[PDB]
Swiss-Prot record, chain A:
One of its GO terms (cellular component) is U5 snRNP. Pfam families: AAR2, AAR2_1st. One of its GO terms (biological process) is spliceosomal snRNP assembly. Present with 7330 molecules/cell in log phase SD medium. It is found in: Cytoplasm; Nucleus. InterPro entries: AAR2 (IPR007946), AAR2_C (IPR033648), AAR2_C_sf (IPR038514), Aar2_N (IPR033647), AAR2_N_sf (IPR038516). Residues 244-265 are annotated as: Leucine-zipper. Component of the U5 snRNP complex that is required for spliceosome assembly and for pre-mRNA splicing. Involved in splicing pre-mRNA of the A1 cistron and other genes that are important for cell growth. It comes from Saccharomyces cerevisiae (strain ATCC 204508 / S288c) (Baker's yeast). The modification Phosphothreonine is found at T257. This is A1 cistron-splicing factor AAR2. Heterodimer. Interacts with PRP8 (via RNase H homology domain and MPN domain), competing with BRR2 for the same binding site. Component of a U5 snRNP complex that contains at least the U5 snRNA, PRP8, SNU114, AAR2, SMB1, SMD1, SMD2, SMD3, SME1, SMX2 and SMX3, but is not a component of the U4/U6-U5 tri-snRNP complex.
Curated annotation (Swiss-Prot), chain B:
It comes from the Eukaryota. Coiled coil: none annotated. Residues 7-237 are annotated as: RNase H homology domain. Changing T104A: Reduced growth at 30 degrees Celsius. Strongly reduced growth at 16 degrees Celsius. It is found in: Nucleus. Present with 468 molecules/cell in log phase SD medium. Component of the U4/U6-U5 tri-snRNP complex composed of the U4, U6 and U5 snRNAs and at least PRP3, PRP4, PRP6, PRP8, PRP18, PRP31, PRP38, SNU13, SNU23, SNU66, SNU114, SPP381, SMB1, SMD1, SMD2, SMD3, SMX2, SMX3, LSM2, LSM3, LSM4, LSM5, LSM6, LSM7, LSM8, BRR2 and DIB1. Functions as a scaffold that mediates the ordered assembly of spliceosomal proteins and snRNAs. Required for association of BRR2 with the spliceosomal U5 snRNP, and the subsequent assembly of the U4/U6-U5 tri-snRNP complex. Functions as a scaffold that positions spliceosomal U2, U5 and U6 snRNAs at splice sites on pre-mRNA substrates, so that splicing can occur. Interacts with both the 5' and the 3' splice site, as well as the branch region. Has a role in branch site-3' splice site selection. Associates with the branch site-3' splice 3'-exon region. Also has a role in cell cycle. The MPN (JAB/Mov34) domain has structural similarity with deubiquitinating enzymes, but lacks the residues that would bind the catalytic metal ion. Contains a region with structural similarity to reverse transcriptase, presenting the classical thumb, fingers and palm architecture, but lacks enzyme activity, since the essential metal-binding residues are not conserved. The chain holds residues 1836 to 2069 of 2413 of the full protein. This is Pre-mRNA-splicing factor 8.
Length: 300, 237
């Protein structure tokens, strides 16, 4: 189990660590989070008390370095930092643990929620979506735009999700206009899976990451990306059986985890009704359809 | 975007544009089977593609063979339309290709947009006008060429005959739609109006009689009365 220590907490802030979250009061004696499960990526996130504008945060993997959080009063945010001095980092952290100034990552032993939400997400791939190569962790916030949004403005601060457009020359074979538009299998399997993602684990990783950024940062472009990636599978008549089974589980846990009160904005009614009730895969998402109907029947 | 009564004069500016109407692409008769079930029998059809400024009609004839062994024909028909339209654009020299294609039904938007992804500069738009182009098969010469086709075929017409020599395209188009609207509301009466007189003939190379300006006024008035009449007979007014 690893630690993300904090220099101090000089402004009042709601802190998130994966699906959990707690309030720190201005200048409270908080020195960070302990007992973080090794083996998964993680995200540590921020919403200032005084300005709920800009949720922001950092994706990281404790295997990839020693990371701490330091408030920057010039730029006005809690910044993630790496300490290359391993020994010095251990000496400081051990002082904090002996003074119990850390919140414990509160994992329940029955609970696989974080694992199920991040099964296919890997730091190396996050870092290609979020281009900032000098750091081993990735900053995201609510306002960041995606490459596709930048085509419909700063390239350095963008989310480079894979571009998906059903009315594009990539998606439609010359001479198969009707077939390719009404059945997206060509686009799903040959263009995206075989050609771009290489395998369904990379496709599912981007999908899961898109979803987590939509949920934690209210990042609109990520929400668009999550839904597009779902719609491309559900609108393909030919999907490997194992992909649909895994997708049903992915979505199930993502619907389970969504805050009930953010449903109206994070869930596209058209895409979900189409996917669950009209599409080629309408009968293939038994777990997802069952939770959607019992938890958000208004949307349908 | 869409096309309504605010930007009506845009039809007659000098940006090439075409209407596309697909309401006669797939035509059937419905009949009883020996077993007392119901079945369809398709008949020839056509795509109505029309430059409103010049009157050039590009009449693509849809021979029933094109449906043999196919399923979901109402849906295939929109895609076949879009494909024939794209094929047409690709056959015109660049300076003849449209800047805009306006479809009369919004269900054609996606099929045509997908087929024209190669032509990103051609705008595909809907319209809020209820245009009566379905009545195109009430023009005898166009009906005749469609029903006699034994194979796919494109026949070119000028739907305004020689009118543009005497009137503006704005006025020719408005005559055309009055004519079509009437033919669509009561084909018999409308056809009675156009052709009971011998003195007035349809030239071999035209679709409509050779009316003088004064006789067109009389015709136009009679068609307005027809439309108003049927509107009463319909709504009991
Ligand atoms: C200025 O602080 C550092 O460079 C540093 N290195 N490791 C830690 C810190 C801050 C205190 C938490 C852990």
């Amino acid at each position: 189990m690893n630690t993300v220590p904090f220099t101090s907490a000089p402004i009042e802030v709601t802190i998130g660590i994966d699906q959990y979250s707690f309030n720190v009061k201005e200048n409270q004696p908080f020195h960070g989070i302990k007992d973080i499960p090794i083996g998964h990526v993680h995200v540590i996130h921020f919403q200032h008390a005084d300005n709920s504008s800009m949720r922001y945060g950092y994706w990281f993997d404790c295997r990839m370095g020693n990371f701490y959080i330091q408030y920057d009063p010039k730029d006005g945010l809690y910044k993630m930092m790496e300490e290359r001095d391993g020994a010095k980092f251990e000496n400081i952290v051990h002082n904090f643990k002996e003074r119990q100034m850390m919140v414990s990552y509160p994992k329940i032993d029955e609970d696989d929620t974080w694992y199920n939400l991040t099964e296919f997400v890997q730091m190396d791939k996050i870092r290609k979506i979020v281009r900032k190569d000098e750091n081993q962790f990735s900053y995201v916030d609510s306002s960041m735009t995606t490459v596709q949004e930048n085509e419909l403005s700063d390239p350095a601060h963008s989310l480079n999700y894979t571009v998906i457009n059903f009315k594009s020359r990539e998606a439609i074979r010359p001479g198969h206009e009707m077939e390719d538009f009404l059945d997206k299998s060509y686009y799903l399997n040959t263009v995206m899976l075989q050609g771009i993602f290489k395998n369904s684990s990379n496709y599912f990783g981007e999908l899961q990451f898109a979803f987590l950024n939509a949920m934690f940062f209210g990042n609109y472009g990520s929400s668009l990306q999550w839904h597009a990636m779902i719609e491309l599978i559900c609108s393909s008549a030919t999907v490997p059986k194992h992909m649909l089974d895994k997708l049903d589980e992915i979505l199930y846990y993502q619907i389970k985890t969504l805050p009930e009160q953010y449903s109206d904005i994070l869930l596209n009614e058209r895409v979900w009704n189409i996917c669950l009730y009209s599409s080629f895969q309408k009968n293939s998402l038994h777990n997802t359809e069952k939770i959607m109907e019992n938890k958000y029947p208004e949307l349908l | 975007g869409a096309m309504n009564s605010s930007n009506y004069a845009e039809l007659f500016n000098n940006d090439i544009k075409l209407f596309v109407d697909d309401t006669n692409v797939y035509r059937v008769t419905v009949h009883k089977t020996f077993e007392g079930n119901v079945a369809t029998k398709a008949i020839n059809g056509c795509i109505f593609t029309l430059n409103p400024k010049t009157g050039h009609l590009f009449l693509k004839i849809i021979h029933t063979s094109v449906w043999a062994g196919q399923k979901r024909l109402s849906q295939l028909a929109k895609w076949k339309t879009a494909e024939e339209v794209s094929a047409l654009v690709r056959s015109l020299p660049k300076e003849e290709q449209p800047k805009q294609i306006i479809v009369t039904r919004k269900a054609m938007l996606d099929p045509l947009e997908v087929h024209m992804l190669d032509f990103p500069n051609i705008a595909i738009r809907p319209t809020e006008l209820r245009l009566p182009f379905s009545a195109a098969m009430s023009i005898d010469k166009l009906s005749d060429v469609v029903m006699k086709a034994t194979e796919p075929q494109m026949v070119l017409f000028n739907i305004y005959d020689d009118w543009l020599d005497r009137i503006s395209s704005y006025t020719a188009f408005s005559r055309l739609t009055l004519l079509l609207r009437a033919l669509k509301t009561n084909e018999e009466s409308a056809k009675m109006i156009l052709l009971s007189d011998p003195t007035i003939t349809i030239k071999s190379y035209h679709l409509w009689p050779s009316f003088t300006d004064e006789q067109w006024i009389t015709i136009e008035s009679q068609m307005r009365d027809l439309i108003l009449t049927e509107y009463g007979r319909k709504y009991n007014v």
